[PDB]
């Protein structure tokens, strides 16, 4: 189903970067389409280029509705978990001072993201794979990053298909994020096939892991859609997984 892979990779989020009232300076908002699959770090440079004309120091951090955004979460998940309900565009407020100690350190360094991004893959592979990432050379690793950094679907997915094929997955890499839960997210072990070999379902995953989804009717959103629970769990892990081989699933309220 190469059709789904392309639709997910080329998904964008309209975002309006506004500068906070306290920031020193006439600054006009910056409009930018964010790749749902990428991270705020990669898009941060263009925000620095625009607002740098008006400025102080460039230790930037973004907030949405007053809660800073996490550099480690994909842009897609963050919008899904926090902003999906409100109208477009994604209204982000840019800050250059008052840096918070609760948020992650200053915007991570290009490799620090590549490192974090590959850690999510090696971990992911460990849940689904023996091992494959250990087989392929360190030459291919730069292809997976370059493909994501430069948004080259072909360059990225040529290598990533090996990570999605299983001999005739042991576990499904997933992280369930809840807006109002003490923990950051819920990650556990789950198999794509039951004791009788039947394909597992999205509803089965939640039933075993996050049963609290089913007064205060929740919304299971992935990549900005509500996929009906009948969906086989494997096909999601093969197609609707983020570039880091992980299924980030959001539990959201309803209007």
């Amino acid at each position: 189903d190469k059709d789904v892979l392309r639709d997910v990779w080329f998904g964008r989020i309209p975002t309006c970067f506004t500068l906070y009232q306290d920031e020193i300076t006439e600054a006009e908002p910056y409009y930018l389409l964010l790749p749902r699959v990428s991270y705020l770090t990669l898009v941060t440079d263009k925000v620095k280029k625009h607002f740098q004309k008006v400025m102080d120091i460039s230790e930037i951090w973004f907030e949405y509705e007053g809660t800073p955004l996490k550099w480690h979460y994909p842009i897609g998940l963050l919008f899904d978990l926090l902003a999906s309900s409100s109208a477009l565009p994604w209204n982000i407020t840019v800050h250059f001072k008052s840096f918070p100690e609760k948020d992650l350190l200053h915007c991570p360094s290009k490799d620090a993201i590549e490192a974090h991004f590959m850690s999510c893959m090696k971990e992911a592979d460990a849940l689904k794979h023996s091992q494959v990432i250990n087989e392929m050379q360190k030459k291919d690793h730069k292809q997976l990053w370059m493909g994501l950094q430069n948004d080259r679907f072909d360059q990225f997915w040529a290598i990533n298909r090996k990570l999605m094929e299983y001999p005739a997955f042991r576990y499904i890499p997933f992280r369930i994020y809840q807006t109002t839960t003490e923990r950051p997210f819920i990650q556990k072990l789950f198999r794509p096939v039951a004791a009788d070999g039947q394909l597992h379902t999205l509803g089965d995953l939640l039933k075993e892991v996050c049963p609290s989804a089913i007064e205060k009717k929740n919304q299971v959103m992935i990549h900005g859609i509500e996929p009906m629970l009948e969906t086989p769990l494997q096909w999601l892990s093969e197609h609707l997984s983020y570039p880091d081989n992980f299924l980030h699933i959001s539990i959201i309220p309803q209007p």
Partner: protein, 38 residues
């Protein structure tokens, strides 16, 4: 082909229609003025 497979391809298509294509043309124009006016 399956209902649940088709539903996701419908939802993704409708998604890009409201989110990306809705703003792709206007956002690029705006940025060109911003730089042309600076």
């Amino acid at each position: 082909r399956p209902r649940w497979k088709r539903h996701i391809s419908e939802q993704l298509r409708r998604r890009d229609r409201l989110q990306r294509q809705a703003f792709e043309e206007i956002i690029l124009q705006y940025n060109k003025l911003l730089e042309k006016s600076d």
